[PDB]
Amino acid sequence: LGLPTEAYISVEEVHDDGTPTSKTFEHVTSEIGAEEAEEVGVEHLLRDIKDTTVGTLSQRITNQVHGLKGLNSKLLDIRSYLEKVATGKLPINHQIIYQLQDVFNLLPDVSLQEFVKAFYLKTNDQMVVV
Amino acid sequence: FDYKEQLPESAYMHQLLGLNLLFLLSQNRVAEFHTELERLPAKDIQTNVYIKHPVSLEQYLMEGSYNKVFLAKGNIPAESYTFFIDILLDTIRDEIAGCIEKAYEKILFTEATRILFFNTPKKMTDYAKKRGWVLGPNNYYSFASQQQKPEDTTIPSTELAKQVIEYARQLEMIV
Amino acid sequence: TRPANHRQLTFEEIAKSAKITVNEVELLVMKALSVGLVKGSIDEVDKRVHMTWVQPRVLDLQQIKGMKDRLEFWCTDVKSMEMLVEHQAHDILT
């Protein structure tokens, strides 16, 4: 569950919110790409343990299960950090925390009548084709 | 029934069959009522009074001629008939209380008593106690809690997910 | 303070909370949207204000505890759904 890289950078700031400043390590998004030669080598190496490219229903359902598992793991990590903050083992950030609050605000809010009707319409429209 | 071919048949046989029909009608076992009624030859369906009375009363109950049932209660040819006629009257009263329950959305005590055929408000109060009909602020029994409109707001989500996963299973199954 | 589901705010409630006349709530909510503090919408016929709030807020230990138990409920729901999907699609999973 997750990529094997985590790129970190050094940031020196004043923190704005009246807190002591330190070297720390700011985070930068990381992703694993490849070039033509490395891609060819990888494809040759993993030609015996590679899943077929194409959305076979088996692989789609497995991916969805994997995404549910990843969501559960991320939520568990967030909950553990929240428990640590509440118990005081770790400091209340005062930042990023309100990022979690924004996440909780962005919840879909299903069971609204209009959305329910639209979603039923879409489900029936797909089921007729099925 | 089994030994009609030798044993003689008495008018007491009609009387007992009619009593059985009345018992079945009173116990609301209408399906069993008709199942038993099929046994009797069609000739005695209308000829014999003992079975005609239960059949007539059941027919009246079929088309909601409940006042007809109450008025015809006096056609009883035997006291044993009268006992089960009282039981049938009680059953019809329960069914009428329902009738006000499910169809109507609200009712009033003054008109509800007439609908349920109660000559004393104490009987309707007992029904409110025995059947627990919620009284209204303006003395209007409320049945709105019965019909309701559930399941029209929340998507099942999980059940249809199971159904779609079943579709995928039946698709990718090798067999 | 809203339960995050009944996000619609009645005009009377906002008038009482902010001690603003009935007609002042429209302008108050409009200013709140304008400066960049709320990203909702306002309805006049029903006198209810749709709320979609993007501006974050500082938290308190009790608020953090509430958020933590709510996230615990969320993760339990996610785990239950994952288990249901996995068990129902064991043959197709592979």
UniProtKB/Swiss-Prot annotation, chain A:
Subunit relationships: Component of the 19S proteasome regulatory particle complex. The 26S proteasome consists of a 20S core particle (CP) and two 19S regulatory subunits (RP). The regulatory particle is made of a lid composed of 9 subunits including PSMD7, a base containing 6 ATPases and few additional components. Within the complex, PSMD7 interacts with subunit PSMD4 through their respective MPN domain. Interacts with TRIM5.
Species assigned in the record: Homo sapiens
Protein name, entry field: 26S proteasome non-ATPase regulatory subunit 7
UniProt crosslink position (Glycyl lysine isopeptide (Lys-Gly) (interchain with G-Cter in ubiquitin)): 50
Coiled coil: none
Superkingdom per UniProt: Eukaryota
Chain's role: Component of the 26S proteasome, a multiprotein complex involved in the ATP-dependent degradation of ubiquitinated proteins. This complex plays a key role in the maintenance of protein homeostasis by removing misfolded or damaged proteins, which could impair cellular functions, and by removing proteins whose functions are no longer required. Therefore, the proteasome participates in numerous cellular processes, including cell cycle progression, apoptosis, or DNA damage repair.
Entire protein: shown range: 131 to 260 of 324
Note: Does not bind a metal ion.
Residues where N6-acetyllysine is found: 74, 84
Family: Belongs to the peptidase M67A family.
Curated annotation (Swiss-Prot), chain B:
Domain spans labelled PCI: 1-156
Covalent cross-link site, Glycyl lysine isopeptide (Lys-Gly) (interchain with G-Cter in SUMO2): 122
This protein's GO CC annotations: cytosol; nucleoplasm; nucleus; proteasome accessory complex; proteasome complex; proteasome regulatory particle; proteasome regulatory particle, lid subcomplex
Keywords annotated in UniProt: Isopeptide bond, Phosphoprotein, Proteasome, Ubl conjugation
GO terms for biological process, alphabetical: proteasome-mediated ubiquitin-dependent protein catabolic process
UniProt key word Ribosomal protein: no
Family: Belongs to the proteasome subunit S14 family.
General function of this protein: Component of the 26S proteasome, a multiprotein complex involved in the ATP-dependent degradation of ubiquitinated proteins. This complex plays a key role in the maintenance of protein homeostasis by removing misfolded or damaged proteins, which could impair cellular functions, and by removing proteins whose functions are no longer required. Therefore, the proteasome participates in numerous cellular processes, including cell cycle progression, apoptosis, or DNA damage repair.
Assembly description: Component of the 19S proteasome regulatory particle complex. The 26S proteasome consists of a 20S core particle (CP) and two 19S regulatory subunits (RP). The regulatory particle is made of a lid composed of 9 subunits including PSMD8, a base containing 6 ATPases and few additional components. Interacts with DDI2. Interacts with TASOR.
Name of the molecule in the record: 26S proteasome non-ATPase regulatory subunit 8
Organism: Homo sapiens (Human)
Gene label: PSMD8
From Swiss-Prot, chain C:
Gene Ontology, cellular component aspect: cytosol; extracellular region; ficolin-1-rich granule lumen; membrane; nucleoplasm; nucleus; proteasome accessory complex; proteasome complex
N6-acetyllysine sites (modified residues): 16
GO BP: meiosis I; proteasome-mediated ubiquitin-dependent protein catabolic process; ubiquitin-dependent protein catabolic process
One GO molecular-function entry: structural molecule activity
Lineage: superkingdom: Eukaryota
Keyword list, A-Z: Acetylation, Proteasome
Entry keyword annotation includes Acetylation: yes
Recorded family membership: Belongs to the proteasome subunit S11 family.
Quaternary state and interactors: Component of the 19S proteasome regulatory particle complex. The 26S proteasome consists of a 20S core particle (CP) and two 19S regulatory subunits (RP). The regulatory particle is made of a lid composed of 9 subunits including PSMD13, a base containing 6 ATPases and few additional components.
Job description of the protein: Component of the 26S proteasome, a multiprotein complex involved in the ATP-dependent degradation of ubiquitinated proteins. This complex plays a key role in the maintenance of protein homeostasis by removing misfolded or damaged proteins, which could impair cellular functions, and by removing proteins whose functions are no longer required. Therefore, the proteasome participates in numerous cellular processes, including cell cycle progression, apoptosis, or DNA damage repair.
Protein name, per record: 26S proteasome non-ATPase regulatory subunit 13
Organism: Homo sapiens (Human)
Residues of the full protein shown: 283 to 376 of 376
